[PDB]
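Example 4.3 (complexes with small molecules)
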Amino acid sequence: DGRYSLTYIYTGLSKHVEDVPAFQALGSLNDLQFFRYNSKDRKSQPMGLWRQVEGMEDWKQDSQLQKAREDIFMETLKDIVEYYKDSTGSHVLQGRFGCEIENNRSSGAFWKYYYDGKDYIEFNKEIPAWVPFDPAAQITKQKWEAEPVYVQRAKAYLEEECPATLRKYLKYSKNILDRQDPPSVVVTSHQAPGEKKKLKCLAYDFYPGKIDVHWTRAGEVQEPELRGDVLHNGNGTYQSWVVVAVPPQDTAPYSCHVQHSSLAQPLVVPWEA
Ligand SMILES: *[C@@H]1O[C@H](CO)[C@@H](O[C@@H]2O[C@H](CO)[C@@H](O)[C@H](O)[C@H]2NC(C)=O)[C@H](O)[C@H]1NC(C)=O
Ligand SMILES: *[C@@H]1O[C@H](CO)[C@@H](O)[C@H](O)[C@H]1NC(C)=O
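Answer. The structure with 2-acetamido-2-deoxy-beta-D-glucopyranose bound is encoded below.
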């Protein structure tokens, strides 16, 4: 088996402006986002290729869960501002948590918070306890450890529930995270009035993202003039391109090359002037 990670990111603003939700949550599985939730619509919604996966999660229920998470989160943000006596200001609290497995074996877990961008508090499951980094965190810690169960629960969340959720999801996501969709390529050219002719090699509809794309001028690998790539989350696919400018009198042979993990051997696509 390989590496898999389940990450969540919560964002809360103490004085949100118009059109910006006070609370936002999102979740990822590896390099893809599978869900989202904000305090405006208050609904946990699958995203990307997960919008088509059935029976992996009861979104209606997970929404009740996010609403409850939101309440605690925003109360936390509220208490920090109350502590700095600055409710007139605009502040942010960000949370990060999740885990990762490698070869079906839990390989890591994390739970950390940031206030106005600085480390606020984080959970150390080995102790187990919260570690304050900011003075107001001393209060927060006192609250999250007011009963013996609490840390026990937090430790149980990272060591048992989270990795269980991740495994459950992997069961329904093989057709998503384990894909090896081969790249479709397209060589194209454009002549800018006054400029040289440029050739653009495009690799698309492929996954995983790791890919090798380069041109060759007479069997000679060229230095790209431009270069970019993108991940279309709704699709779960990448696109990577390269662009070379060609001398207005060059006659040499131009061919594009693509190497990807899903290919038994590299691909070549010459440009026919
Ligand atoms: C995945 O989504 C991307 C982005 O929506 C698709 O790319 C678009 O494809 C259409 C027609 O093929 C083009 O007209 C658009 O210009 C493309 N968007 C851009 C700017 O990248 C892609 O085709 C989708 N792949 C699959 C397999 O559905
Ligand atoms: C790991 O995968 C096995 C099958 O490969 C599964 O039965 C098990 O529940 C998973 N996690 C463990 C070791 O509990």
